[PDB]
Amino acid sequence: VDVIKFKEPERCDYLYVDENNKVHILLPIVGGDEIGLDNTCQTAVELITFFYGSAHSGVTKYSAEHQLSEYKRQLEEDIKAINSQKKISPHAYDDLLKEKIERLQQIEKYIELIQVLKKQYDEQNDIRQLRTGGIPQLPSGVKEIIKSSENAFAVRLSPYDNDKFTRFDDPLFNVKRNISKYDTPSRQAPIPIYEGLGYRLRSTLFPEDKTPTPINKKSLRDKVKSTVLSHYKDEDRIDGEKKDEKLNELITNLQNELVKELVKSDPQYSKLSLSKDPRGKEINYDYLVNSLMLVDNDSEIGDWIDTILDATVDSTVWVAQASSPFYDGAKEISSDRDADKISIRVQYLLAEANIYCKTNKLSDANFGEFFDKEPHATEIAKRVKEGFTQGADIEPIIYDYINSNHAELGLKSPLTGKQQQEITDKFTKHYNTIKESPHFDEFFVADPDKKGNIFSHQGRISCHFLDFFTRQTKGKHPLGDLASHQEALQEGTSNRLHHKNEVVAQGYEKLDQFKKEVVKLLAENKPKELLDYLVATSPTGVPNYSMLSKETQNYIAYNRNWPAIQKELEKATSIPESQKQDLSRLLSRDNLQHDNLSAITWSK
Amino acid sequence: VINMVDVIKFKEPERCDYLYVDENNKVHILLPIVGGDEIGLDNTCQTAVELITFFYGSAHSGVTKYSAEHQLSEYKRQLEEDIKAINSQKKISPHAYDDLLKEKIERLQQIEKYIELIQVLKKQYDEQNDIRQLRTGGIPQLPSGVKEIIKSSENAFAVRLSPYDNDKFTRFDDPLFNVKRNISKYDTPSRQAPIPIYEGLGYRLRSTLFPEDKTPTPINKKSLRDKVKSTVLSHYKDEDRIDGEKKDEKLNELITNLQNELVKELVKSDPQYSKLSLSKDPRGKEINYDYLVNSLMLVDNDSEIGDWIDTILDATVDSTVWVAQASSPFYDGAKEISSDRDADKISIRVQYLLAEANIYCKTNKLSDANFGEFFDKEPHATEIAKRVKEGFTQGADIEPIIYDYINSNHAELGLKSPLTGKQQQEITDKFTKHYNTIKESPHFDEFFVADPDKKGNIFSHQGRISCHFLDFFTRQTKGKHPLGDLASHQEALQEGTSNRLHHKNEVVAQGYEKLDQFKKEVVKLLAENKPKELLDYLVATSPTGVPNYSMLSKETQNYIAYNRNWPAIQKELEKATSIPESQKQDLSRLLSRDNLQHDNLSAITWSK
Ligand SMILES: [Mg+2]
Ligand SMILES: [Mg+2]
């Protein structure tokens, strides 16, 4: 069957091809996008798979070397298939061919580099250990990349039952920890320390006397209703000779309280009003009591509030933001496990705020060091405890405490409301991502929208393989043709790399676009244009007719107006002799050296 | 004032409230029923709000919203300004913007009719004050024409539920799903408290979930991991150990039982996990006694079985396995049901799930039955409430308890066949999305739910759930006012691919984009120095037959007329084989300065 089936896929594990067709291999540190999903004992998993392959959920994952070798094979099949057309068309697929050869040569080189790294430059067993080590460690080359990153940072926290086997040793945020159960003879329970942030959060939120902490979280509507009702008494009524005036005071107070509470989340609500119905009708006694017949002189202030709200406010208004991880539906903190959970949350917020400041160049301090100290450890725990009882927003309690201390945290200036909302959104997203982690000791957090040495690619947080290779080889194996490739990846728009390679895919779409142009220019019977199209050259100077294949050759040769096309060819003057004779072979059945190009296909 | 600048600023926006222009440039006005996409955000007393605004405008959050009539009149004005601007170029170029002009005029003429139809609907055909009452005299009703559209719909349905504190002012009167309700507080002298009926689904759910003796119902929801742990641990005892002769054999049974249980439970969500194995770590190393105890040093003789389990899981399973589904609305973090209000909340969820299952069957033509009628009846009301109660105390998934109860009674619910697992998961996903959308409603009495992915007379547009204004107009005027040129517009919208209408109008937008592309072609064809192509391009026509040079404006006329190539261009235009007299003459007026009748076209601009 005379069809070329192109095999080069548009996606391969660990491989990013940039717009300039430079091939980059991304060494993975841990799995994830911005926050790492692997930690503690499993930190090494990605690296194990990269260097050695592995079995995940009884489905085999192959090494980078295996996968790159397979991609090489496919490129060679593609190249050999293109070359088979050269006896028919000397210029067949010239751009696609060169781009494929360019990638093949780079990939071979990367295969060589991985090989020499494992064979020659692992005398300390730093990579081998991934495979033999009881609980493996990050190779030092990766530890150094981490240490020098400007855009990715580990944080270390204090869960009650801490795991000794943390694997990120340069965290930005770091707090005191219990003695892991694994550093006790029987390995069963941690040995608690009685100082620092972790302890103060746990001991305060669920105390040794077992007194629960109530969580009194109110929806917006409930929060506004009750607040307003607080300045009233159970016996209060909208009755009397002062009823209209009392209804007015209620309307105004409820309006003030609804607005004030709405405005913090969206100041569009600054202009919301409760004095009137959508249809313009005035919210007064006669309307609600004698016309709508909903409340009366004997109604409670709460039932007047309900009625005011239902008659004047749009349902849109009551739609909640996303929830804070701090409020997950629980009525109370009623067990050491609940307290530990919430302690971790607080700590993780403070770690996100620390990352935020570090990555935006506002501070290099370790916020943990400060919050572990007294009275801060204690004060922050009490204000958070009080927050849950008020049903208040937890994040601003942390931000106000940071801001009342900004200089001591290394910050020239307090955090603005806008910077606060950005931290909250990262914290919320990142936390929701890792909240079913079996261990909260540690996370690595990367921002691929900033300049640096760490990247996001195919669900892995990664660095450039060449960064790693150079560090681990100490400069002793120069990179030849790949010496500028690491620098080239920095020059891209973003550290967030696309999961597929568009430059590979476009090498197929261009062959499809060429077919469309040809089918159109023939259906439109404009033969001079067809010839100009074919002879028109791409940026590299290659003629479009390079992209002929069985289908396009047959459309042209057997078309209606081929005689018309052939007249133009002979009588053209501007088309060089090379290409007249070339097109004539290809498109004229009468040509001595006429032959059929193969069909071409691929997987989309 | 004479800071006049020779530039046409097009005013027609690409978006206008209530207005959808289809790919054939037919204008459609969408009459809104309630706000929302699939599930209506308005209900009970506020049901009429969209209609209030459509016909009369209204003030919301102290921002004015204008009537359809006002907004279409403004759009008409903008269209006329664009038409007059285009026309002013005609003395310079007879064919200036011929396609855009025509498209704009077409839209204008249709928009004027719709403006006329609304006016006449209000002046002539509101004798019973059906539209008027939106503005007046009590909590307004949907107008009868909208109710009939609702009654007729194949793709949208109201559902009516039983909250403890019910609001009598429901406003959807043909619900698919409907259950018995308390006597609203508003049907009592003092207006303060409902009168509870003590029969039906609602009652049984509330009374069962938090009983009159005030005993809490524990909600024992576990993580997948905790659920697997505790289960496996149930087959064990506090003093069971992995020692000491037979340790290796006992370790192996734990692995198997843990593996079977992890798999049994994961497979229910993704059968890619059928082949998961706890038998070796990622690097192929065997999970045995010597490895966890002597080498890694993580557990020993005396460790509890629960700690062996932790260690097995931690050494074998990837963090991804533990990533839970989005939650069910049923499990919202609470440890128990411990107040009438908690029970009322959960009762409404159960009810709303059953209403979705009902909508799904109706929508896919599997049943016309009212599921509420069946679930209000004993023993069904009681039994389904008990099974949901047991479910919560087990930490079981609530949705399948409902589906299995439905399937054990499928015939009686008008179903040929039980609901398949796939159909079950489609119901759960709609229920989850829709419930989450309305879960802060002040009233749960009723909701209108539309599926704009199905064939029917209800649509989604601009965050409104809507019907075609012509559907309404025809019904409300009882056929007496012929639609004239719009007589096929309603059918045309049916012929479209989806009832989910795009919020802006691409046909309007593309009328600007085509002037931009024309510019690019021109700037390319000149920089590449290809004179015959440029001429060819200019002289080539769109589908309507209009030549591309209709799209010249100051910028492109000047690019051509003062380019290097111009004498080269002019020469080609004269050797002139292909081009008809009339067009040779135009292009020459337009592009040659020596031409007697040479004049400058205006620049053109628009807001993106
Ligand atoms: Mg461990
Ligand atoms: Mg009401």
Give the residue extent of every domain in chain A. Answer: 1-11+62-121+590-604, 12-61+122-192+437-497, 193-218+321-436, 219-320, 498-589
Asked if A250 contacts A301 with a C-beta cutoff of 8 angstroms, the reply is yes
A223 in B contact zone (CB under 8 Å): no
- Six-digit token pair at B472? 């309404």
Question: How many residues in chain A?
Answer: 604
Taking the C-alpha atoms of residue B497 and residue B133, their distance in angstroms, rounded to an integer, is 36
CA distance B61 to chain A (A): 4
Dihedral sign, Cα of residue A361, residue A362, residue A365, residue A367: negative
Percentages (nearest 5) of helix, strand, coil residues in chain B? 50, 10, 40
Q: Residue B445 C-alpha to ligand 2 middle, in angstroms?
A: 11
The answer for B589, left when phi > 0, alpha when psi is -120 to 50, beta otherwise, is: alpha
Nearest to A318 among B52, B298, B440 (CB): B440
> Looking at the partner chain, which of A37, A272, A310 has a beta carbon nearest the beta carbon of B320?
A37
Place of tokens 């043909």: B174
- In whole angstroms, what is the distance from residue B158 CA to residue A367 CA? 54
Q: Are the CB atoms for B168 and B184 separated by under 8 Å?
A: yes
Are residues B472 and B149 in contact, defined by beta-carbon separation less than 8 angstroms?
Answer: yes
Dist CA B103 CA B483 (whole Å):
21
> Nearest 5°: CA angle at A288, between A283 and A291?
115
Looking at the DSSP bridge assignments, the partners of residue A174 are: A156
**How far is it, in rounded angstroms, from Cα B565 to Cα B557?**
13
Write out chain B residues lying below 8 Å of A311, CB-based. 45
B411-415, Cβ contacts within 8 angstroms, sequence gap of 24 or more: B412/B374, B413/B361, B413/B367, B413/B369, B413/B371, B413/B374, B414/B361, B414/B366, B414/B367, B414/B368, B414/B369, B415/B361, B415/B366, B415/B367
d(CA B241, CA B308): 9
And the tokens for B498?
């989806």
Residue B461 parent element (H or E): strand B459-461
Comparing C-alpha atoms, which of B117, B180, B176 is closest to residue B150?
A: B176
Compute the 3-state secondary structure of chain A and give helix, strand, coil in percent, each to the nearest 5: 50, 10, 40
Technique employed here was: X-ray
CB contact under 8 A, A58 and B322: no
Long-range contacts of B475-482 (CB under 8 A, 24+ apart): B475/B144, B475/B145, B475/B148, B475/B149, B476/B121, B476/B125, B476/B130, B476/B131, B476/B143, B476/B144, B476/B145, B477/B121, B477/B124, B477/B125, B478/B125, B480/B125, B481/B117, B481/B120, B481/B124, B481/B125
Cβ–Cβ contact B3 with A under 8 A:
no
Cα end-to-end span (Å), chain A: 20
- Cα(A474) to ligand 2 centroid in Å equals 76
Neighbours of B187 (CB within 10 A): 12
CA distance A108 to A380: 56
CB atoms within 10 A of CB B220: 13
- The three-class DSSP label of residue A422 is helix
Q: How far apart are CA A587 and CA B470, in angstroms?
A: 57
Residue B319 is nearest to which of A37, A278, A320, comparing CB atoms?
A: A37
Residue B541: phi and psi, rounded to 5, are: -120, 160
Q: Is A131 part of the contact surface with chain B (CB cutoff 8 Å)?
A: yes
- Please judge whether B62 and A271 are an interchain contact, meaning their C-beta atoms are less than 8 angstroms apart: yes
Residues A420, A428 contacting (CB under 8 angstroms): no
- Contacts of residue A192, defined as CB under 8 A and 6 or more positions apart, other chains included, come to A160, A178, A179, A199
Neighbouring-strand partners of residue B452: none
Q: One-letter amino acid identity for A557?
A: A
Residues of A in contact with B35 (CB under 8 A): 315-316
B72-to-A97, A117, B462 alpha-carbon distances in Å: 57, 71, 16
**Residue contact B303–A187, C-beta within 8 A:** yes
Asked if B324's CB is within 8 angstroms of A279's CB, the reply is no
Q: Are strands A442-446 and B217-218 parallel, antiparallel or unpaired?
A: unpaired
Resolution in A: 2.4
Q: HSE (CB half, 13 Å, CA atoms) of A152? A: 31
Q: For chain B, first and last CA: distance in Å?
A: 26
Query: Residues 241..280 of B with a Cβ closer than 8 Å to A: which?
Result: 272-273, 275-277, 280
- E strand or H helix that includes residue A104: helix A94-120
- Cα–Cα nearest to A158, from A188, A197, A190: A197
Chain A positions touching B283 (Cβ under 8 A) are: 48, 52, 54, 130-131
Contacts of B321 in chain A (CB under 8 A): 57
Query: Which of B275, B283, B333 lies closest to A54 in CB terms?
Result: B283
Alpha-carbon distance A83 to A78, whole Å? 9
When CB atoms are compared, the residue of B61, B302, B334 closest to A314 is: B61
In this complex, which of A54, A57, A299 lies closest to B275 when CB atoms are compared?
A: A57
Find, in chain A, the residue whose alpha carbon is nearest to that of B41.
Answer: A315
In whole angstroms, what is the distance from residue A415 CA to residue A119 CA? Answer: 51
Pairing of strands A152-156, A442-446: antiparallel
| Dist CA A58 CA B278 (whole Å) | 9
| Closest in B43, B53, B62 to A273, CB measured | B62
Nearest in space to B413 (alpha carbons), one of B359, B382, B374: B374
DSSP codes of every residue in B462-501: TTEEEEEHHHHHHHHTTT-S--GGGTTHHHHHHTSS-SB-
Quote the CA–CA distance of A557 and A574 in Å, as a whole number: 22
Given CB atoms, is A317 within the 8 Å cutoff of chain B? yes
Using an 8 Å CB-CB cutoff, list chain B residues near A310. Answer: 45-46, 442-443
In this structure, are residues B410 and B417 in contact, taking their beta carbons and an 8 Å threshold? yes
Please check whether residue B546 touches A, CB under 8 A. no
| CA-CA-CA-CA torsion sign (A544, A548, A552, A558) | positive
Q: Which residues of A touch B224 (CB under 8 A)?
A: 436
Fill in the DSSP letter of residue A316: G
CB atoms within 10 A of CB B426: 15
Contacts of B52 in chain A (CB under 8 A): 278-279
A445 phi/psi in degrees, rounded to 5 = -125, 125
- CA distance linking residue A352 with residue A349, whole number of Å: 5
Q: How many CB atoms lie within 10 A of CB B340?
A: 16
* Residues of chain B numbered 136-155 and touching chain A (CB < 8 Å): 136-140
Q: Is B524 on the interface with A (CB under 8 A)?
A: no
Q: Which residues contact A68 (CB under 8 A, 6 or more apart)?
A: A12, A14, A15, A25, A107, A110, A111, A114
Cβ contacts (< 8 Å) between A529 and chain B: which residues? 536
Query: Would you call B335 an interface residue with chain A, using a CB distance cutoff of 8 Å?
Result: yes
